[PDB]
Amino acid sequence: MTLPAFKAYDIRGRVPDELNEDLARRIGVALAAQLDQGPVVLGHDVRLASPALQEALSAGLRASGRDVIDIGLCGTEEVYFQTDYLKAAGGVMVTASHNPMDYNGMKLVREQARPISSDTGLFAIRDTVAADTAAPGEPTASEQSRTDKTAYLEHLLSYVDRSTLKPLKLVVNAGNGGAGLIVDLLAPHLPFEFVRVFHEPDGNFPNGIPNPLLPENRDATAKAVKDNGADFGIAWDGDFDRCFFFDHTGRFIEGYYLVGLLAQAILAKQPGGKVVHDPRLTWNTVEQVEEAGGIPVLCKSGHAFIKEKMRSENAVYGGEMSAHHYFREFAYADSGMIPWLLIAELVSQSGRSLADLVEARMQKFPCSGEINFKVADAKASVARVMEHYASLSPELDYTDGISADFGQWRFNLRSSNTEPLLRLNVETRGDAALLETRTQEISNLLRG
Ligand SMILES: O=P(O)(O)O[C@H]1O[C@H](CO)[C@@H](O)[C@H](O)[C@H]1O
Ligand SMILES: [Mg+2]
Numbered sequence: 410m411t412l413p414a415f416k417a418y419d420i421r422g423r424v425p426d427e428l429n430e431d432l433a434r435r436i437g438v439a440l441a442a443q444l445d446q447g448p449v450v451l452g453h454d455v456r457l458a459s460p461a462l463q464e465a466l467s468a469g470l471r472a473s474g475r476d477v478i479d480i481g482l483c484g485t486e487e488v489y490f491q492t493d494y495l496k497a498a499g500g501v502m503v504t505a506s507h508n509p510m511d512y513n514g515m516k517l518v519r520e521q522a523r524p525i526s527s528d529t530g531l532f533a534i535r536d537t538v539a540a541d542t543a544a545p546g547e548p549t550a551s552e553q554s555r556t557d558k559t560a561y562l563e564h565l566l567s568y569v570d571r572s573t574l575k576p577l578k579l580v581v582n583a584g585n586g587g588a589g590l591i592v593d594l595l596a597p598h599l600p601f602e603f604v605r606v607f608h609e610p611d612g613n614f615p616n617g618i619p620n621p622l623l624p625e626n627r628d629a630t631a632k633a634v635k636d637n638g639a640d641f642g643i644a645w646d647g648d649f650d651r652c653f654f655f656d657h658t659g660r661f662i663e664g665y666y667l668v669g670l671l672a673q674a675i676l677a678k679q680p681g682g683k684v685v686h687d688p689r690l691t692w693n694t695v696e697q698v699e700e701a702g703g704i705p706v707l708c709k710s711g712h713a714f715i716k717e718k719m720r721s722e723n724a725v726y727g728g729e730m731s732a733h734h735y736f737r738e739f740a741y742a743d744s745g746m747i748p749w750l751l752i753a754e755l756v757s758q759s760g761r762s763l764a765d766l767v768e769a770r771m772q773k774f775p776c777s778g779e780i781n782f783k784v785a786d787a788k789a790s791v792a793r794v795m796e797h798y799a800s801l802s803p804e805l806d807y808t809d810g811i812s813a814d815f816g817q818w819r820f821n822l823r824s825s826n827t828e829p830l831l832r833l834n835v836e837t838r839g840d841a842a843l844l845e846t847r848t849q850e851i852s853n854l855l856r857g
Contacts, residue, residue: 414514415535417527417826418713421505421514424458428513430465432538434545436515437469439537440499443530444519447498448476450491452483454504454648455587455610458513463503471548481556482610484587484649486744489522490561493740499525504648507620522740524713562594564739569750574600575757580633580642580655582606584619584626588649591746601753606633619647631659640756641763643749651732652745654752656764665690665776666767667748668728669697674751675726676701682725685718688809689821689834690730693774709809711826716741730779730834777835777848782855787831791822794854818843820851831855
């Protein structure tokens with residue numbers, strides 16, 4: 410077989426059987442042979458095993474003659490930012506993001522923080538690691554510790570006009586991951602009052618693993634917003650490359666609507682720019698991008714596809730409905746910090762609540778949310794769906810699975826590249842009843 414920890418976009422596995430210090434060291438050796446010239450940035454998250462896995466990575470990199478730049482405990486986006494900012498050959502973030510306690514992993518990038526994925530180097534690394542029985546060499550290169558976050562913080566702050574910000578009251582929920590460190594370093598430069606929930610980094614995760622999609626974790630943010638009269642609330646996953654928004658009523662905002670909202674926010678600063686979006690939910694983004702003077706660019710979902718499309722298009726912003734937001738000026742990379750700064754600025758400047766900024770969009774393009782199906786035969790299930798709707802002659806698009814546009818409603822149905830699942834998204838033109846009947850109809854067909 411092959412090493413299970415090597416996935417489509419990253420490395421992730423249970424410690425110590427699927428990922429351990431020996432494997433991490435061998436990954437460092439193999440990575441050194443895949444990169445162009447230069448040093449390698451290393452960072453890690455709050456998980457208990459992350460520092461030791463980073464040290465083993467560093468040992469393998471330095472045995473292969475790579476200088477290492479240790480940026481310490483950080484978010485994934487800080488590895489992306491520093492890899493690009495320091496003109497490094499590449500970077501590795503040690504993180505399991507939102508996964509259980511016994512899991513860890515790595516996200517690997519090359520120059521300019523360009524992703525290393527299964528077909529762009531990661532499986533080559535896997536195959537090298539799988540066959541490597543060489544004795545570990547000794548270091549022929551040095552490690553320097555570079556924990557200064559000043560350039561990163563200045564970059565985050567550059568997205569907003571600080572003189573226009575109002576002293577909004579914001580709930581922030583790090584979930585005992587790493588986001589609270591950055592919030593606290595940004596706070597002296599912002600007028601906001603923060604209400605800090607689950608703020609201290611703790612890799613034991615006493616309040617649950619950092620996954621703001623779990624309703625129990627969602628509710629801690631919502632309750633803090635409502636009980637404190639906060640303008641809005643923000644929650645992050647453990648490595649804070651995803652952020653999640655709660656309006657002043659405590660309502661969790663479906664990530665679809667943030668794409669159009671952030672696109673409009675960015676297009677105010679970068680007029681006429683291109684905006685990359687995924688095919689799962691589209692109508693609202695296309696309309697909001699066009700009405701702000703931007704050009705929407707459809708792209709298959711998946712961060713590596715999004716980033717490569719943004720680069721080819723000089724796109725100013727890309728967004729996925731799955732709480733991933735990418736910014737050209739940020740090495741084309743995703744940040745869980747830039748989005749809430751932009752939203753706080755939009756609320757401050759417009760005088761509108763986050764709820765009202767999205768309410769009419771949610772009414773105009775209601776959506777199912779992503780619904781996941783584990784079925785006995787995904788291919789046969791998809792065929793049952795398409796056969797049922799054939800007589801209606803939908804307009805079909807194969808950018809990312811199957812998209813079917815029926816006029817007043819549409820759906821996307823695709824296999825996940827990170828899990829053995831089918832994922833369904835449905836939206837309609839202002840018709841909640843049609844949304845429900847079609848969603849239920851498709852669901853019955855998938856489960857047939
Ligand atoms: O499993 P999927 O749906 O193929 O991919 C999922 O993880 C990717 C990396 O986080 C994201 O870029 C996708 O938007 C998300 O849907
Ligand atoms: Mg994450």
